[PDB]
Amino acid sequence: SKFGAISSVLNDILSRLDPPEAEVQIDRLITGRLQSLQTYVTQQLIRAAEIRASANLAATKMSECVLGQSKRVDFCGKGYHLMSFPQSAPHGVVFLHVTYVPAQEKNFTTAPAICHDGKAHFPREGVFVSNGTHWFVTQRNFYEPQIITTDNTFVSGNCDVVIGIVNNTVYDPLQLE
Amino acid sequence: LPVSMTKTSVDCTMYICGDSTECSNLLLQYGSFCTQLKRALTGIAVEQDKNTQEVFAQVKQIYKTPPIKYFGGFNFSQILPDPSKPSKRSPIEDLLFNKVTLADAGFIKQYGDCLGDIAARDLICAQKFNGLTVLPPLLTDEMIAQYTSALLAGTITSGWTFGAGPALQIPFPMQMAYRFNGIGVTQNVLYENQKLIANQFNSAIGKIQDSLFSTPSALGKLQDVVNHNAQALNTLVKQLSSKFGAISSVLNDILSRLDPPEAEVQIDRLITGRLQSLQTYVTQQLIRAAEIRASANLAATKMSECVLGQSKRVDFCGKGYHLMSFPQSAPHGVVFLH
Amino acid sequence: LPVSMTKTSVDCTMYICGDSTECSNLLLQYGSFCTQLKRALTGIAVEQ
Amino acid sequence: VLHLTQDLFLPFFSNVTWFHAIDNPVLPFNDGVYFASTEKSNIIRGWIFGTTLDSKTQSLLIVNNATNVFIKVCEFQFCNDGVYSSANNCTFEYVSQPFLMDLEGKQGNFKNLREFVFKNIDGYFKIYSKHTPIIGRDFPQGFSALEPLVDLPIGINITRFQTLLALNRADYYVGYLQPRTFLLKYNENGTITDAVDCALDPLSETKCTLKSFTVEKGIYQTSNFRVQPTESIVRFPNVTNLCPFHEVFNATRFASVYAWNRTRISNCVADYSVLYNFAPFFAFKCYGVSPTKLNDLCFTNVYADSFVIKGNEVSQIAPGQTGNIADYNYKLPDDFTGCVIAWNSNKLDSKHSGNYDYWYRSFRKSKLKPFERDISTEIYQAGNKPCKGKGPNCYFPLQSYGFRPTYGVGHQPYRVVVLSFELLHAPATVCGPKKSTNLVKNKCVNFNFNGLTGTGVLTKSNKKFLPFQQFGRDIVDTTDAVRDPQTLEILDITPCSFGGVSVITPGTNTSNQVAVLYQGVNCTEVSVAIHADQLTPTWRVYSTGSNVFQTRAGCLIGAEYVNNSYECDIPIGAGICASYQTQSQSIIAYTMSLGAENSVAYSNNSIAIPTNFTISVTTEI
Amino acid sequence: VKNKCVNFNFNGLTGTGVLTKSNKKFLPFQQFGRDIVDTTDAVRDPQT
Numbered sequence A: 001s002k003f004g005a006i007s008s009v010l011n012d013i014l015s016r017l018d019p020p021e022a023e024v025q026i027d028r029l030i031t032g033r034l035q036s037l038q039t040y041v042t043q044q045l046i047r048a049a050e051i052r053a054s055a056n057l058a059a060t061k062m063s064e065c066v067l068g069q070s071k072r073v074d075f076c077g078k079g080y081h082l083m084s085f086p087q088s089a090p091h092g093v094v095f096l097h098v099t100y101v102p103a104q105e106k107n108f109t110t111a112p113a114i115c116h117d118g119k120a121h122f123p124r125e126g127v128f129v130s131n132g133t134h135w136f137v138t139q140r141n142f143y144e145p146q147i148i149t150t151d152n153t154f155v156s157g158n159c160d161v162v163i164g165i166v167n168n169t170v171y172d173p174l175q176l177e
Numbered sequence B: 001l002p003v004s005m006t007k008t009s010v011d012c013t014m015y016i017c018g019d020s021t022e023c024s025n026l027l028l029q030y031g032s033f034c035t036q037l038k039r040a041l042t043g044i045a046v047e048q049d050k051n052t053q054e055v056f057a058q059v060k061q062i063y064k065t066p067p068i069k070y071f072g073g074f075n076f077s078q079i080l081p082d083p084s085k086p087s088k089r090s091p092i093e094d095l096l097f098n099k100v101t102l103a104d105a106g107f108i109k110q111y112g113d114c115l116g117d118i119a120a121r122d123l124i125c126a127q128k129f130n131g132l133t134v135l136p137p138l139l140t141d142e143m144i145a146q147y148t149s150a151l152l153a154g155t156i157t158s159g160w161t162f163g164a165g166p167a168l169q170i171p172f173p174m175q176m177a178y179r180f181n182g183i184g185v186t187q188n189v190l191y192e193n194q195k196l197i198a199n200q201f202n203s204a205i206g207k208i209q210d211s212l213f214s215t216p217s218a219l220g221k222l223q224d225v226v227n228h229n230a231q232a233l234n235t236l237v238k239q240l241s242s243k244f245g246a247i248s249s250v251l252n253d254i255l256s257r258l259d260p261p262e263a264e265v266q267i268d269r270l271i272t273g274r275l276q277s278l279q280t281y282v283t284q285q286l287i288r289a290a291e292i293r294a295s296a297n298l299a300a301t302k303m304s305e306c307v308l309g310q311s312k313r314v315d316f317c318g319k320g321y322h323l324m325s326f327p328q329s330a331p332h333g334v335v336f337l338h
Numbered sequence C: 001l002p003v004s005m006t007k008t009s010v011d012c013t014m015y016i017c018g019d020s021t022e023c024s025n026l027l028l029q030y031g032s033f034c035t036q037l038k039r040a041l042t043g044i045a046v047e048q
Numbered sequence D: 001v002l003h004l005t006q007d008l009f010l011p012f013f014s015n016v017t018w019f020h021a022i023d024n025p026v027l028p029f030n031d032g033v034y035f036a037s038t039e040k041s042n043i044i045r046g047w048i049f050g051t052t053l054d055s056k057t058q059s060l061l062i063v064n065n066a067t068n069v070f071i072k073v074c075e076f077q078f079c080n081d082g083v084y085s086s087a088n089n090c091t092f093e094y095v096s097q098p099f100l101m102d103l104e105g106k107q108g109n110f111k112n113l114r115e116f117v118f119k120n121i122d123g124y125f126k127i128y129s130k131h132t133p134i135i136g137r138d139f140p141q142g143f144s145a146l147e148p149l150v151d152l153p154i155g156i157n158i159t160r161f162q163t164l165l166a167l168n169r170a171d172y173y174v175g176y177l178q179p180r181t182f183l184l185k186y187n188e189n190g191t192i193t194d195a196v197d198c199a200l201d202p203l204s205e206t207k208c209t210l211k212s213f214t215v216e217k218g219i220y221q222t223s224n225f226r227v228q229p230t231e232s233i234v235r236f237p238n239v240t241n242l243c244p245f246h247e248v249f250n251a252t253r254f255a256s257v258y259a260w261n262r263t264r265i266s267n268c269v270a271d272y273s274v275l276y277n278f279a280p281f282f283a284f285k286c287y288g289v290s291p292t293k294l295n296d297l298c299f300t301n302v303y304a305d306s307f308v309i310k311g312n313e314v315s316q317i318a319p320g321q322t323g324n325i326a327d328y329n330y331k332l333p334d335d336f337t338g339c340v341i342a343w344n345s346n347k348l349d350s351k352h353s354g355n356y357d358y359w360y361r362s363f364r365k366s367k368l369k370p371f372e373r374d375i376s377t378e379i380y381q382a383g384n385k386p387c388k389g390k391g392p393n394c395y396f397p398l399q400s401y402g403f404r405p406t407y408g409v410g411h412q413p414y415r416v417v418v419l420s421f422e423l424l425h426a427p428a429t430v431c432g433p434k435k436s437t438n439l440v441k442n443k444c445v446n447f448n449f450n451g452l453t454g455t456g457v458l459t460k461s462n463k464k465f466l467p468f469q470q471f472g473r474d475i476v477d478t479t480d481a482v483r484d485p486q487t488l489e490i491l492d493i494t495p496c497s498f499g500g501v502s503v504i505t506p507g508t509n510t511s512n513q514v515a516v517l518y519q520g521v522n523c524t525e526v527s528v529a530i531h532a533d534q535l536t537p538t539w540r541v542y543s544t545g546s547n548v549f550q551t552r553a554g555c556l557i558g559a560e561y562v563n564n565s566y567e568c569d570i571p572i573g574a575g576i577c578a579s580y581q582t583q584s585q586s587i588i589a590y591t592m593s594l595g596a597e598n599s600v601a602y603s604n605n606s607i608a609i610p611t612n613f614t615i616s617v618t619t620e621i
Numbered sequence E: 001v002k003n004k005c006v007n008f009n010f011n012g013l014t015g016t017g018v019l020t021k022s023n024k025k026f027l028p029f030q031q032f033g034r035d036i037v038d039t040t041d042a043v044r045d046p047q048t
């Protein structure tokens, strides 16, 4: 690009103009090329800052997803994250987020707590769920109904303050023995 | 958190050489200094679109609130969309829109009334007079509101399950119990003071609306983004009245006043001034776009964690033990209710 | 981890034209090439 | 390589006039001519060029023959049918190998399609050719590049153009070139395989600005569009009094340089033809303005300083000049906007026995700052004497411009006047002799209001212009409103149409159909502009009424709006996305579908628990 | 001289570099060479 000079070839305008004549044109070419190089350097700096942001993100992703299980949702892939496997790529990394995703689900019923005898029973972990006629306890992300026993649930309440409690019988493994 | 900035599509040919064949011909002597700037602005605009996409388009399926709205006592009418309003936005979402004023909408197609401006032609007409336009966002503030409605309805009817796979309905009292159990307090606490916690939730939600209403500007970040963009654009257009050492600052004047072989010098000075100013604008826009991209990535992470689930990371999703987070769309940004 | 850098607030008027009225008048013909820099550095310091 | 060039080319799918033969029309020539023909053996010898083809202007002739050519530059008279009858002032003969080549495969079936291209760019007559043995019966459509044969710096004026015939006992394909931008694909062997115009189709323009021949699916910002003005209005003031240039020029006692008579010229129309008439010019060197463009300018005030000075002193009078006159007598300011007029006057500043009436200052206490008169007779001090008189060490400051009818050119009494203008923002009382056209409103036009040039749309206003107000602006210092000089009314000024064109296309491997999006413009405006053919874009994309969609982001031409909702394929802006969908295939724009409409089954006591699970591995890059 | 760093003045085209035989397909009117970035690549030898 001539940048408003006589020509865009250094070896030409040097051999075609004595220093004084060339000087002015050489100055024009320098002030054009130097400005273009500054533009390139600034764009490279900004792109390198962006790539450093992406690389810090990738390093965090590796340190969390790869070297461990990440409890933060939608960070290591969509769904409940299980594990990850890095794969080297040209000028980058590729992750293989292995994720646990739920499937077919059924309306059953639910209640915040179960009142056996004047006392409220809450699940130690999991949901209170009902087939429709026999109440059950089960985990949250998988339907594994279990008989509601005094070890599956902890009792704290008075059967009169919980909104939505349901009458049912809980089981204890000690009375039989 | 800011999510996006105003998209501009600077055209150097019109900006630097208003309909001047001689000026354009001398500009072709500067090489592809222009296609670089046009490409950079195109990349910034696409990057803004991608930022909004990442922040909001997190849920593939658009959910809706049930026809009846009784969430175990929790009063969500303040953040749920209002069917009565034509724009279908939340009461707390309307305040943000009314508390932010955009200098140039971009989606105005204002041409035709600059002649009809009657009074002094405004900033938008002036910018159009010199090759400086604003593109509109791909996602309108009406469908972004529907994204936010989907995100909000998914977190009140399905807890965090919709952030993983199929949205599994769960009563809000039980979702509250599960969030409580997620921070080390047993469910019986919630099921024994459900009425009290519902009252506290309603009071806090109600009093945040007044806290935003009466405050001068708590949205200073979004208004800061808007002011920075408008001010950079105004500084850009103001450089068209700088002589840069030329006889005059009007190309049509110095072209109609000087014959070509002499006017080439003044036009070259004008080129070398205006190109430098335009490159300054482009570089500052690139830096601001990098900052906004960082902020939008942070906002996307905050949405994905705080909204689509409970975050164990302390002080990340608000101060205290995080329970949930309701996003609310704002002009060129997002507002979370931790 | 770095948390902040030095807050610089260079003034273009003196930096380019040390107490020279002629240089100030010539700089004025460059438009707002100065307020931009001053605002940028003020924003940098506030952000620090 | 995909090198992009900007030169004279035949526009793709342009108009080419096909002739016959069995008288020989004189085709006009301008910006180059594409020539093609298809003959059995030989029926076209050569071509004739030049202006008026007579013995008054140089002409050309490129007649071929069996073995060589006969290129020449001459001033032939006529032949009305050897090929001429006059070679008087005629040179630059030329002979080389014959342009025509013919080969037959033992059969006259083959009719080589001979194509030629000529041009006259800065002289240097260029000729390009390529012989395709392919019979050109039906103008072929495959690509065939053109190789230069000869290139001779003719250096004449060519406007008309003719051709020659043969004797005996379907051809003449002619097209006209235009300055267009082309993108050319070079083969690995250095030939050209395919080229695409860059002002023909929206797809072609996108392909040009995205230099390639395969354009992937997406939206590309290519250029902008501008409503070119239709009329050009010039509204100069309501005054017709010619300026007093005649009086100052018709004067005779032009004062000396020490007392430069300065006349003020205002409230008049300056037609510098009278400046030319009373002026055997010697030095019309103008600085702030071009002397050619002086009848189209408006100046706030015009000064005329007249003073007779010597031969060298006129070259010594200039902005920031130095010397005995430009330091103590008359100094022009550095930023002078105007010029000097000098013509010899040896009949009015001369007589027998001599004349010494004029004067000039040589001795001043200091330099004369620009535009100051220093009429004073104080003897210059030398040494330290307060001497008041003449003699040695006591010098009378100003010496005499004695003028007689006998001096050398360096000493004749040159009559010099300077014209100083003030070309700034203020009601101009002095303007050129340009006529004041009518005023047209609500239509993009070029205006020259009181010398304020520009382009845009004008109309009525409800401003409160104070009586002294004359202009309008905004916080950005851009001329907004101009008071009409001959109507005293307020007219706002609008941008021409400035916007931005983005072409929306699927991959060229899929289809050639595209969608054009004009940014931020009501599509009625671009439709009337298209119908008036005042739009800068030349790719006139079709408008069948079904392909127009006033988007919130501009308006879309070439895509039909469907009320359905699909996933966003090509982003447009403002909730609109375009995609290539079957009908049998066309481009459709639609409001983006944010996702499948779903309603959850929330209830007081209804819960969903997954009875099964899946493991999915997603990828992140 | 080929395969050696030399300063060339080919028909007024000045520059420095290394030259060698090519298998180009220069057209008979072809005289110079270049590349995608428009830099002189090949020169037809005036005397060969």
Ligand SMILES: *[C@@H]1O[C@H](CO)[C@@H](O[C@@H]2O[C@H](CO)[C@@H](O)[C@H](O)[C@@H]2O)[C@H](O)[C@H]1NC(C)=O
Pocket (backbone or CB within 6 Å): A131, A132, A133, A134
């Ligand atoms: C309640 O949950 C019961 C699971 O124990 C289901 O009852 C089963 O019924 C079969 C006979 O139909 C028994 O053989 C078995 O032992 C078990 O009791 C029952 O289907 C379920 N209720 C509903 C409505 O699904």
Ligand SMILES: *[C@@H]1O[C@H](CO)[C@@H](O[C@@H]2O[C@H](CO)[C@@H](O)[C@H](O)[C@@H]2O)[C@H](O)[C@H]1NC(C)=O
Pocket (backbone or CB within 6 Å): A165, A166, A167
């Ligand atoms: C669960 O079972 C309780 C006794 O086993 C029920 O309490 C009864 O309440 C009635 C009034 O509804 C009293 O009249 C009676 O004396 C006894 O206290 C309780 O109602 C029941 N709850 C449900 C939801 O079935």
Ligand SMILES: *[C@@H]1O[C@H](CO)[C@@H](O[C@@H]2O[C@H](CO)[C@@H](O)[C@H](O)[C@@H]2O)[C@H](O)[C@H]1NC(C)=O
Pocket (backbone or CB within 6 Å): B075, B076, B077, B078
């Ligand atoms: C949920 O919270 C809403 C807050 O806007 C309540 O609306 C209120 O309606 C009354 C009129 O009855 C207004 O006076 C008040 O200003 C407010 O708009 C709404 O009733 C409430 N609903 C429930 C079920 O809690």
Ligand SMILES: *[C@@H]1O[C@H](CO)[C@@H](O[C@@H]2O[C@H](CO)[C@@H](O)[C@H](O)[C@@H]2O)[C@H](O)[C@H]1NC(C)=O
Pocket (backbone or CB within 6 Å): D187, D188, D189, E025
């Ligand atoms: C470039 O020129 C080469 C030299 O002629 C071509 O190679 C030739 O290919 C032909 C067959 O087409 C062979 O018969 C010959 O021996 C030689 O290999 C080459 O094809 C050509 N490339 C083009 C035109 O794209």
Ligand SMILES: *[C@@H]1O[C@H](CO)[C@@H](O[C@@H]2O[C@H](CO)[C@@H](O)[C@H](O)[C@@H]2O)[C@H](O)[C@H]1NC(C)=O
Pocket (backbone or CB within 6 Å): D247, D248, D251, D261, D262, D263
């Ligand atoms: C410069 O010379 C001009 C021509 O002689 C003067 O203009 C004229 O002056 C006469 C008086 O001599 C007027 O009657 C006439 O109307 C016209 O103005 C001009 O005044 C003179 N200026 C100076 C400063 O000497």
Ligand SMILES: *[C@@H]1O[C@H](CO)[C@@H](O[C@@H]2O[C@H](CO)[C@@H](O)[C@H](O)[C@@H]2O)[C@H](O)[C@H]1NC(C)=O
Pocket (backbone or CB within 6 Å): D611, D612, D613, D614
């Ligand atoms: C949970 O989902 C699995 C796959 O998503 C089921 O496995 C299937 O098993 C059948 C045979 O029964 C195969 O034909 C099929 O390809 C798949 O492997 C699994 O049965 C299912 N389990 C339940 C309890 O629904």
Ligand SMILES: *[C@@H]1O[C@H](CO)[C@@H](O)[C@H](O)[C@H]1NC(C)=O
Pocket (backbone or CB within 6 Å): A105, A106, A107, D601, D608
């Ligand atoms: C639960 O019941 C509702 C009531 O019709 C139904 O719409 C929903 O699909 C059911 N969910 C299931 C079966 O998972």
Ligand SMILES: *[C@@H]1O[C@H](CO)[C@@H](O)[C@H](O)[C@H]1NC(C)=O
Pocket (backbone or CB within 6 Å): D013, D014, D015, D016
């Ligand atoms: C070529 O000329 C014919 C004859 O009028 C006309 O119909 C046709 O439109 C012209 N070509 C183009 C591209 O306009």
Ligand SMILES: *[C@@H]1O[C@H](CO)[C@@H](O)[C@H](O)[C@H]1NC(C)=O
Pocket (backbone or CB within 6 Å): D065, D066, D067, D068, D069, D095
């Ligand atoms: C053809 O033109 C050449 C050019 O001088 C001439 O010598 C020759 O006599 C002409 N005729 C033939 C048959 O070659």
Ligand SMILES: *[C@@H]1O[C@H](CO)[C@@H](O)[C@H](O)[C@H]1NC(C)=O
Pocket (backbone or CB within 6 Å): D088, D089
């Ligand atoms: C050639 O041109 C000169 C120009 O003065 C003219 O006098 C002369 O007659 C011309 N030769 C002719 C006509 O043969």
Ligand SMILES: *[C@@H]1O[C@H](CO)[C@@H](O)[C@H](O)[C@H]1NC(C)=O
Pocket (backbone or CB within 6 Å): D051, D157, D158, D159
């Ligand atoms: C060339 O001829 C045209 C047609 O008469 C004329 O208008 C033009 O001025 C001529 N140019 C020159 C340089 O003679």
Ligand SMILES: *[C@@H]1O[C@H](CO)[C@@H](O)[C@H](O)[C@H]1NC(C)=O
Pocket (backbone or CB within 6 Å): D249, D250, D251, D278
């Ligand atoms: C003065 O006016 C007369 C009018 O006839 C004209 O002939 C003469 O040339 C003029 N002189 C000058 C110097 O303009």
Ligand SMILES: *[C@@H]1O[C@H](CO)[C@@H](O)[C@H](O)[C@H]1NC(C)=O
Pocket (backbone or CB within 6 Å): D238, D485, D486, D487, D488
């Ligand atoms: C302009 O001049 C004409 C002729 O003297 C007159 O009729 C008209 O009213 C004038 N207009 C203005 C605005 O002075």
Ligand SMILES: *[C@@H]1O[C@H](CO)[C@@H](O)[C@H](O)[C@H]1NC(C)=O
Pocket (backbone or CB within 6 Å): B109, B110, B112, D522, D523, D524, D525, D550
């Ligand atoms: C732009 O939109 C339509 C289409 O042209 C029409 O009402 C008018 O031209 C403009 N309307 C407004 C409100 O600017």
Ligand SMILES: *[C@@H]1O[C@H](CO)[C@@H](O)[C@H](O)[C@H]1NC(C)=O
Pocket (backbone or CB within 6 Å): D561, D562, D563, D564
């Ligand atoms: C179909 O599209 C038309 C506009 O082309 C619109 O007026 C109409 O309401 C649409 N119909 C439906 C059912 O959306």
Ligand SMILES: *[C@@H]1O[C@H](CO)[C@@H](O)[C@H](O)[C@H]1NC(C)=O
Pocket (backbone or CB within 6 Å): B068, B070, D602, D603, D604, D605
């Ligand atoms: C939930 O309970 C409330 C109050 O008891 C009642 O108004 C509402 O209709 C119930 N909804 C369902 C789905 O049971």
